[PDB]
């Protein structure tokens, strides 16, 4: 079941005494006339505070349980009250799934690491909240489906616990020989204090238009007239990011589909610039690739550009592909092609026996075998100096301890896989203080019209309704501005059509009241709002749309002036 609260869940927001002062406060309350669940049990959510009322002369409610897991292995709050007094306690418990001579307390079976102790019909109201690690309880016990009235609740405890709460339960006294659960929302009230300093009345500042007038005027009695209380603001829906078609294309073809790759010792570096195209265009014709890209999937880098991209390509044996990766050692990684420890690109390698081996032996591709020192990352060495392993100078002729340092792979088609040739393409991506000239897509998306939307046209960010225009740009202009230099028209990059941008209707909201001493009926005027864009009696005036008043054909003396010859009165 569900019930309707009336004016319940109002508590003293703080200390600080006070006299006859219509004070306005913002805090966590139970909204007036709210939808409160009814229970006669299961774990309930917390989310932000709790209202808890009940009715019964006896005491059926035997404490609460709070916390994040409501189980062991972590600490929780437990509040009980035997016939003595309230007992706050914060330990790590082990709760019965169904907690409940005259012997009792079968709720838990563990109380470890206690960090807090304390010992010491009818309506029993409570307000629970948990802010900055403090668990507050307000309460009041007033003697008499709940009735109808107002009563402010006073602080009960102050508990510096630190506990987090996301769920809670309740405890009931069974028979062996009714309660409410609301939640709190951030609202604003106007509180009336008497001379004794207690709260006697309140206004919920987010309900009826008349209450908004009371709150703006700081009174509970409004005199006849028309009051401006707030405003109407249409809100935009959806976020459409429009963009142009892929300008140019990055010449990856001429890198991967080249007829001849370099030797690894003399690896080839193609620098890429100023070419748009999604980054997942590669790994198409997927299931042969050794695609290994480190620290980022191609999905994530597909929508992240870069200033420059470098394409290094060479040829090695399958056995050695493993060396084309950061932090490896061997002839290739020490002497030919070293990747840095902090590498942020990809390695693509595929087998090319059909292209780079032949029966007589393909001696085209070489690799460096000897070198005095390991390469710094991305270093190239093409010198053909004789490597001096002995202690006699070599003077440039091979001989004893004098080795020409480039050998030759011997690629024949009958080698095993690990001795066959593999072509390798190494992609590096860099970021600098220069504009990023290499990017894939921008996020495809369609285009709607006649709706307040959040739009972006290749950099132009704004909000408004898009409509067909009747302007004519020059054949080089993208967008137009009005007088006072604000954008009012754009051109769609894809379809090349001019669209106007109009603001999404706004205006003041006024409340028309006969006076609280006459009636509580009210009508509302939306200033210069069309009656089709507002969300009975709807009346269109040159001043806006008037809702809640009937328009008659008679003519009276003006009482409450609306505008443009229209007045309102409380007569018929």
């Amino acid at each position, epitope marked *: 079941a569900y019930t309707n609260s009336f004016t319940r869940g109002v508590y003293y927001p703080d200390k600080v005494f006070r006299s006859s002062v219509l004070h306005s406060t913002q805090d966590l309350f139970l909204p007036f006339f709210s939808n409160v669940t009814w229970f006669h049990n299961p774990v309930l959510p917390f989310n932000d505070g709790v209202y808890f009322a009940s009715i019964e002369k006896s005491n059926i409610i035997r404490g609460w349980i709070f916390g994040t897991t409501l189980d062991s292995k972590t600490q929780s709050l437990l509040i009980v009250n035997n016939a003595t007094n309230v007992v706050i306690k914060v330990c790590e418990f082990q709760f019965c799934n169904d907690p409940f001579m005259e012997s009792e307390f079968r709720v838990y079976s563990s109380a470890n690491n206690c960090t807090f102790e304390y010992v010491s019909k009818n309506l029993r109201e409570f307000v629970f909240k948990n802010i900055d690690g403090y668990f507050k309880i307000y309460s009041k016990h007033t003697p008499i489906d709940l009735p109808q009235g107002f009563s402010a609740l006073e602080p009960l405890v102050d508990l510096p616990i630190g506990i987090n709460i996301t769920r809670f339960q309740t405890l009931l006294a069974l028979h062996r020989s009714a309660y409410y659960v609301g939640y709190l929302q951030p609202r604003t009230f106007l509180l009336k204090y008497n001379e004794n300093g207690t709260i006697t009345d309140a206004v919920d500042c987010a309900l009826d238009p008349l209450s908004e007038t009371k709150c703006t005027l700081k009174s509970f009695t409004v005199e006849k007239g028309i009051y401006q209380t707030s405003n109407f603001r249409v809100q935009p829906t959806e976020s459409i990011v429009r963009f142009p078609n892929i300008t140019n294309l990055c010449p990856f073809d001429e890198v991967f589909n080249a007829t001849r790759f370099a030797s690894v010792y003399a690896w080839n570096r193609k620098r890429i610039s100023n070419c748009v195209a999604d980054y*997942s265009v590669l*790994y*198409n014709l*997927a*299931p*042969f*690739f*050794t*695609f*290994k890209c480190y620290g980022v*999937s*191609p*999905t*994530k880098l597909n929508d992240l550009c870069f200033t420059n991209v470098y394409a290094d390509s060479f040829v090695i044996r*399958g*056995d050695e*592909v*493993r*060396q*084309i*990766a*950061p932090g*490896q050692t061997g002839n290739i990684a020490d002497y030919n092609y070293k990747l840095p420890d902090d590498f942020t690109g990809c*390695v693509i*390698a*595929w*087998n090319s026996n059909k292209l780079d081996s032949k029966v007589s032996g393909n001696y085209n591709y070489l690799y460096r075998l000897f070198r005095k020192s390991n390469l710094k990352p991305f270093e190239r060495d093409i010198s053909t100096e004789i490597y001096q392993a002995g202690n006699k100078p070599c003077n440039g002729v091979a001989g004893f301890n004098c080795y020409f340092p480039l050998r030759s792979y011997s690629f024949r088609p009958t080698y*095993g*896989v*690990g001795h066959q040739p*593999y072509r*390798v393409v190494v992609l590096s991506f860099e970021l600098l203080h220069a504009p990023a000239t290499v990017c894939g897509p921008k996020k495809s998306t369609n285009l709607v019209k006649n709706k307040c939307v959040n739009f972006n046209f290749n950099g132009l960010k704004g909000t408004g309704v898009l409509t067909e225009s009747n302007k004519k740009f020059l054949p080089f202009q993208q967008f137009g501005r009005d007088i006072a230099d604000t954008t009012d028209a754009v051109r769609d990059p894809q379809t090349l059509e001019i669209l106007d941008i109009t603001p999404c209707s706004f205006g003041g909201v006024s409340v028309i009241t006969p006076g609280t001493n006459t009636s509580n009926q009210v009508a509302v005027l939306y200033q210069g709002v069309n009656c089709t864009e507002v969300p009975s009696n709807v009346f269109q005036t040159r001043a806006g749309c008037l809702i809640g008043a009937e328009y008659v054909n008679n003519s009276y003396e003006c009482d409450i002036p609306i505008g443009a010859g229209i007045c309102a009165s409380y007569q018929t």
Partner: antibody
Amino acid sequence: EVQLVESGGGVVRPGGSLRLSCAASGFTFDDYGMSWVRQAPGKGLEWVSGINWNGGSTGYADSVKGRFTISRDNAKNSLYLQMNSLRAEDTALYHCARVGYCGGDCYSLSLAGFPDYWGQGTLVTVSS
Amino acid sequence: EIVMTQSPATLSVSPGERATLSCRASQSVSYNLAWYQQKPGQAPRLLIYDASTRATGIPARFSGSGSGTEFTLTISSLQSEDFAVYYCQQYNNWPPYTFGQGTKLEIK
């Protein structure tokens, strides 16, 4: 931590069909290939099928070709094995595995290297 | 298919001693070989990949070696928790990936 949780194992009649599922957590799922491996009671491991990181390349063992179909949902971090025309010889514990990326450019065909993380598996029993 | 043949089928070794397991591929798998440990009622665990690269969090006692067709797993000083079935796997050609028949390591 990387976790792989298999479901959809059970008893099925010969010629029947079953659909295994594996939920993956604790890693970027679209950044890895996935495989199924099975183990019959008291036998060694048999690789069944695998799929690359985007789902654009699949492979199957000769014992299950044309009967089984591997698929993945990257938005759900989930791997599936549709098994049709089941036989008594298909009775096994089925493990889903994340396929590790070998020591760098391993030159391997698809994104499937070696299984690096394994789920505990789900039992499939094919009996009349 | 590439056939992976392990030897011995069973190996009985005392705690503290060195254990060595062999795996032979019927064709060259280059360095595309992994080693796994499987305990009763547990999923297989990767020990070595790339014939010799130790997986993260695997103890230093475990080492792999070999290339082409012949591979070994060595346990330098056997612990009580190392008694298990060990599998080699090739991943050089996809598909199929193939496992060895397993080697049972037991207490002598």
